Design a protein around this ligand. Structure first.
Ligand SMILES: [Ca+2]
Lengths: 223, 21
């Protein structure tokens, strides 16, 4: 997150970190046993880390739980990044409370102008690189279809949307992928890709979670 | 391909993607 702020400890209680000896992606808790993240963060040997703040220090409210299943979308394309979504099953259910909590799925899509909350332990610099200890936050609006399409000619499918600042200075970045985009209390987006971090006229591009609700529900029910 | 690898939000996953192109 470039141009964001320190969230505060456990103020984003559905924020997970994905860990295999180190932090490599984020994700969102959607119930006590399942996490949404990016298909492009698929790997083996994933540990889910819940109610983290400082990811380098044990501080008190962490639950470390191994993934027992990672289900990348069947129609995921690595070249286009279309259908960039993955479901992770926890080996055992998380204990849920105020500092570890699931985030609701959308019941409809959100519109252009809506403010959203994007979080993560990704890089904080737009040129050069710098990774934080504690969780970072950013308030950013959804952009019109046309402005998104006009920012990235031919790359925006119907399962993507942009959010951010056309002027630069404020964006998600490397390390934030898999992470949540929360708008009026719903998980609408997933940190996916963009052209640099915080570049003028290159806002971020997020997996449009409202198109996957039924899939998510049915995948969960059958696994 | 590689430019899109860089677009995904140097780490190993990027390097893999990079190698894979
Ligand atoms: Ca910690």
């Amino acid at each position: 997150i470039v141009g964001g702020y320190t969230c505060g400890a456990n103020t984003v209680p559905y924020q997970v970190s994905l860990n295999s000896g180190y932090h490599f992606c984020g994700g969102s808790l959607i119930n006590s046993q399942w996490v949404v993240s990016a298909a492009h963060c698929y790997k083996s040997g994933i540990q889910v880390r819940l109610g983290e703040d400082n990811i380098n220090v044990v501080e008190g409210n962490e639950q470390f739980i191994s993934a027992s299943k990672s289900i990348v979308h069947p129609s995921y394309n690595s070249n286009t990044l279309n259908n960039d979504i993955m479901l992770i099953k926890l080996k055992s259910a998380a204990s849920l409370n105020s500092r570890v909590a699931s985030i609701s799925l959308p019941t409809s899509c959100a519109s252009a102008g809506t403010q959203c909350l994007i979080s993560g332990w990704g890089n904080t610099k737009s040129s050069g690189t710098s990774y934080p200890d504690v969780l970072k936050c950013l308030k950013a609006p959804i952009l019109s279809d046309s402005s998104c399409k006009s920012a990235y000619p031919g790359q925006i499918t119907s399962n993507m949307f942009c959010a951010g600042y056309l002027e630069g200075g404020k964006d998600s970045c490397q390390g934030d992928s898999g992470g949540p985009v929360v708008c009026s209390g719903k998980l609408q987006g997933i940190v996916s890709w963009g052209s640099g971090c915080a570049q003028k006229n290159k806002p971020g591009v997020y997996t449009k979670v409202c198109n996957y609700v039924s899939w998510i529900k049915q995948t969960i029910a059958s696994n | 391909c590689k430019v899109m690898c860089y677009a995904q939000r140097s780490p190993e996953l990027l390097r893999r993607c990079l190698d894979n192109c």
